[PDB]
Design a protein around this nucleic acid. Structure first.
Lengths: 548, 548, 195, 48, 97, 49
DNA sequence: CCACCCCAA
DNA sequence: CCACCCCAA
DNA sequence: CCACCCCAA
DNA sequence: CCACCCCAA
DNA sequence: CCACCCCAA
């Protein structure tokens, strides 16, 4: 064994150009992972109670109460964009390609090393590192996805985005059924509202164990653990955005009058009065045919309650939203159309030569315009009879429930069997790749965290742990937890992710928005005199498309 | 693994004599290379600004401003003559052979050893060296020459020329687009001329990475990395020099009068006046047919500006020249005909038992005479009507631009579609072997650094690095750069370079200039009582040939 | 020596004196190895006379040039590296809703840098012995022929069998596509009007 | 022609539509057209 | 038309069908004409303004399509420029109807 | 033109491969290096000379 | 896996 | 088990 | 040598 | 019975 | 002689 290599390193991005604008994208990410000895070799059940934040009777979205069980097992997640590509590759797929497709996935672990630490208390004292060539590593595959699913992208507990940079798995943990009650309360709400931790419903007690449910492969130094090739059965992702609303659909009016001189100030007037125009409307009252009135085939996107913090048996939680932009990013509401927010640090973006424990983030703002400006709507009477009168129109400005800050926009849900929609684009790096699917008879149309949602089972989680190294004293009949040899192990991980996508043709006349290097970009994609690295976020879908 | 050998040592020079004066020269150089742990495991971008030398307003050729990026990767170069032959072998190829041809090239690495250093702070303190048999070496081949090309001969960062002497690879580095401006200025030029470091043109930003672009082979102790056999498609090199100018071409005059007694003082006179001689001239004015006047089929070599420091977007740089000698090495200008200059130290010549940081060098002066004595030219009027008059002739002595030191010789470029030329001979040892070729639609006729310039792709660079050995503490989310185990590794490198050349026949009567051992050479090719070694430079092409 | 802190102001110094550096130069006089001195395999582009209006039996005509850019387009000479100039009207660019007989044009400035800043060269004595002295260096500023405006840069031709070159890129729209070839035994390496 | 692959890490200079381009590639209320000149070779390469 | 082949190879076939108009030639005779602008080349300053040449006019009207602007639009170019590395010229065929 | 170079053997004129240029009434029979030929009796020239 | 100072009894 | 800045002489 | 919370695509 | 400074296109 | 914004159901 312990004499020779087990694998090879490959962090290459291969572009296999096929026939009919079809390409083969096989991304390989061979990172060297380090891992320490688990604190406890015992499973824990821990309750988090931050009922010191949920008492101010102002703060209710700061509820951090949950019940989780810790596992001595250390997980490994590679479900991210930043791990599979660099700023150079992405630009290619984004500028050159139209739509992308996910294919294969196979993980491989090699060149396992396990070293023991000897603390020679002499003066300094000093530390002597050695090799326990008989030591082991405990590998586990949940090939039968028997266990919960913890995508470690959500909390930037992924793998390093810089290959030449050694990374670390994430200590595994999952949810245990915690029951609670918490009633809202503003600054004024007198007395203590209501908030408690019931405990646990004996029905919903799922206590998992990797040792019991999943085999463990005891690797040494001269052993290689490799997966297979995982074929993916999920829907394509489109590298295109829709810029069409409801006012940019169909046959525009006929302009009986056109300018005769230049300037975007000289407007071509139709030349007919609104209550004598031909065409179709979805009204039986009026005779006014307007760009706002006319009947359009359907509705793009929807309008839902914003900052609508619902709640159930586990506690309050915000209401998701799958909306593009809508309104020039100078007129948002980065809320209404729920724009993601990403917080990472040092190992998944951010300047490597930084300091402190303060993340950096960005509020990714797509290109697609299905989103809304809930500050330019209105609900009026069936009689129309405008110019509408106050008592005959409920606007954004007009409070609802007597309170100021509130709206009908805030409480509004316009989602009809006529709602048209586009899935959540990739958010690279940071962003997630693929995400399991709910086991509910009825399933969400699309997820908000990943462009891909697998239709069948997805790759099984790779759980990586260190095997207990024991001393000459060990009494299994002791209250305390024995004393083991301070062991750690570093191993090389490799990845092969396969994507298949199409090439974009030109059909307009006007060039399309591409990705480039400005005089303001340059030093965003290059190391610094000290070796300061960081990966910036960049828009995915930047290329027009027709919605109708 | 770790029990047995992986390779063998061979530093033998094989001469396979074939049929028709054809020989097979297979040089093998198996050197044992040592390599330390890279400072930083991060890539750097560093700017060099020596704007303390370029201010004296005298010194403009001392511009050392460039932008380079450091790579944790340590390179290995063997593109030299001294590594493949010894003073004994060369003499053979030089004295016996006519023309030489480059064939195969294959590298092989074996008997990898990785040791950790334990610093036992106790009294001295003391150092304890051990073996980390599970450690690794990261090998890389740029078989797809995706990366820049850094021939490490230029700066004598090659490999040792003495086989029984352990050597060291060169820390890899390459150029990053640096923009600058610098205007000349003599001792007098008042005020501060102009000189700045613009920065970087966002267009020309190439940030390479070996991990990303090239696979890495993780070698242990019981692993062998070997290349293939690289076939070379470059032009032959001639072990012959041309001694013919323009005055030694064709049918000399007929000497109507010959001496009748001895002495090189008794000259045989033609016996006809210059303005009544038969033959051809390239003049329509005169009737004077002279050895200087007569029409010769073409022109040997050319005459270019000397110490013509041009400049572009990166900064000033001297103008190359490919000229033999011209004038007895007692009358040079070691400038006009640009004679190379070589600076090495201890590991590539020079007396091993030397001290200090002061190179030794030599100004290699070929045998071929295509070079010029720009101190015996002249430009005169179309009327000729000599004896030429001042106002009718611009000579070397006559200043141009009003300044003394300057000439028309200094600013002169006589390169016509009639210029005949001979490539730059091998400069052994030191000198380079083969050099990639520019990727420009139009390409240089010949290089000034190497006899061989490959027509297609050349061998890929061999990048040798040490794998990060990590301790029990490592936080990838730290501003500082972790702490690794002080690891180094020594490995044996072997080389097989293949050459095919022809044998020289005798055709004159007078012996040809050969290489020998004088009473002044002897102790230039033998170790000393202490073991002082050094390799001297020696002329390549020493054997006549006809130019016409 | 490498910096230990950030900033493009903190430069990493080599740490060796110029007249004691190892490597190769194309000089037999000096011992100074500099980024300007060191021997490079060849020369990129060339340096020719600029606004060198020759003439023959048909009449005077300017001297072509096939050079990229060289120097940040903030430091040109749109002459030295002969940048094309294009004049069209209404049917080959230009705003259709225009008037008069006055073309519109552009001076296409490539990306490739083979071009030169002929305002940062110099020709000095074989002795080097710098800091160079006036009488020992002919610079751009220094007139040639007694006239001011003139240079040696203006009359200079550095084109050696070592000159590396890249052909003239497409200039779209306007620009030409393909162009016949001269019927001369000897032919131009590349044209300046067509890729 | 051939397709370009990515080999660096830093994105390459591409052609795009700015807020200053837009109306350089579209007819006008009257039908005013014109075609601007644009750089050809905008992508690095190695000379050595 | 962009015909994507195998091994990053593409086929670019540009078609430009323009409607040409043409008037009756002035003269149905060939001419030989000399241009002498020796009113510009006298100021003894202006020598690059020499517009003297000898040309012969043909009643025949030519047709040139040797340009980039005729074969592509700002949309197509951007593609070839952003997506492709090196370009190669192949066929050329003209048709009048 | 009339650029007499030199090397190790001695000075020698610089060749030129140029046609004519300018009406042979405006030459420089030098600039465009026009050949010059000198023979006698057995390769031209009047035999009865 | 040792042959006549190389490849190569 | 090195070919023309990727897969892939 | 990863398929739909086990053996077992 | 003339081929690339020998035998020997 | 109309198929999913090109060649090309």
């Amino acid at each position: 064994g312990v004499g020779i290599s087990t694998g090879t390193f490959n962090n290459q991005t291969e572009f296999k150009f096929l026939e009919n604008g079809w390409v083969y994208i096989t991304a390989n990410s061979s990172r060297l992972v380090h891992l320490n000895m688990p604190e406890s070799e015992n499973y824990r059940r821990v309750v988090v109670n931050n009922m010191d934040k949920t008492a101010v009777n102002g703060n209710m979205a700061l509820d951090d109460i949950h019940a989780e069980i810790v596992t001595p097992w250390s997980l490994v997640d590679a479900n991210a964009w930043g791990v599979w590509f660099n700023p150079g590759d992405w630009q290619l797929i984004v500028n050159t390609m139209s739509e992308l497709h996910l294919v294969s996935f196979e993980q491989e672990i090699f060149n396992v090393v396990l070293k023991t630490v000897s603390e020679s208390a002499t003066q300094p004292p000093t530390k002597v590192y050695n090799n326990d060539l008989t030591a082991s590593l405990m590998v586990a595959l949940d090939s039968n996805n028997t266990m919960p699913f913890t995508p470690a992208a959500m909390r930037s507990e992924t793998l390093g985005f810089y290959p030449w940079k050694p990374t670390i798995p994430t200590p595994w943990r999952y949810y245990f059924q915690w029951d609670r009650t918490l009633i809202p309360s503003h600054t004024g709400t007198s007395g203590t509202p209501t908030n408690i931790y019931h405990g646990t419903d004996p029905d919903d007690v799922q206590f998992y164990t990797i040792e019991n449910s999943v085999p463990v492969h005891l690797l040494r130094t001269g052993d290689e653990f490799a997966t297979g090739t995982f074929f993916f059965d999920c829907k394509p992702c489109r590298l295109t955005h829709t810029w069409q609303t409801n006012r940019a659909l169909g046959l525009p009016p006929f302009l009986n009058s056109l300018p005769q001189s230049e300037g975007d100030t000289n407007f071509g007037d139709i030349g007919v009065q609104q209550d004598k125009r031909r065409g179709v409307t979805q009204m039986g009252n009026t005779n006014y045919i307007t760009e706002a009135t006319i009947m359009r085939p359907a509705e793009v996107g929807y309008s839902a309650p914003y900052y609508s913090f619902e709640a159930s048996t586990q506690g309050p939680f915000k209401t998701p939203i799958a909306a593009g932009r809508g309104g020039a990013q100078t007129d948002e509401n980065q809320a209404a159309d729920g724009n993601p927010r990403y917080a990472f640090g040092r190992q998944h973006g951010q300047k490597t030569t930084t300091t402190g424990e303060t993340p950096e983030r960005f509020t990714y703002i797509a290109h697609q315009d299905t989103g809304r400006y809930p500050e330019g709507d209105w609900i009026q009477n069936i009689n129309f009879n405008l110019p509408v009168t106050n008592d005959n129109v409920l606007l954004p400005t007009d409070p609802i429930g007597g309170k100021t800050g509130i709206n009908y926009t805030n409480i509004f849900n316009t989602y009809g069997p006529l709602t048209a929609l586009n899935n959540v684009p990739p958010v690279y790096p940071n962003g997630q790749i693929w995400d399991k699917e709910f086991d509910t008879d009825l399933k969400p149309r699309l997820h908000v965290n990943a462009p891909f949602v697998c239709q069948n089972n997805c790759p099984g989680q790779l759980f990586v742990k260190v095997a207990p190294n024991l001393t000459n004293q060990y009494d299994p009949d002791a209250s305390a937890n024995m004393s083991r040899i301070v062991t750690y192990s570093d191993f090389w991980w490799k990845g092969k992710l396969v994507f298949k996508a199409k090439l974009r043709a030109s059909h307009t006349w006007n060039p399309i928005q591409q990705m480039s290097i400005n005089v303001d970009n340059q030093f965003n994609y290059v190391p610094s005199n000290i070796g300061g690295m960081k990966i910036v976020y960049e828009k995915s879908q930047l290329a027009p498309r027709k919605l109708y």
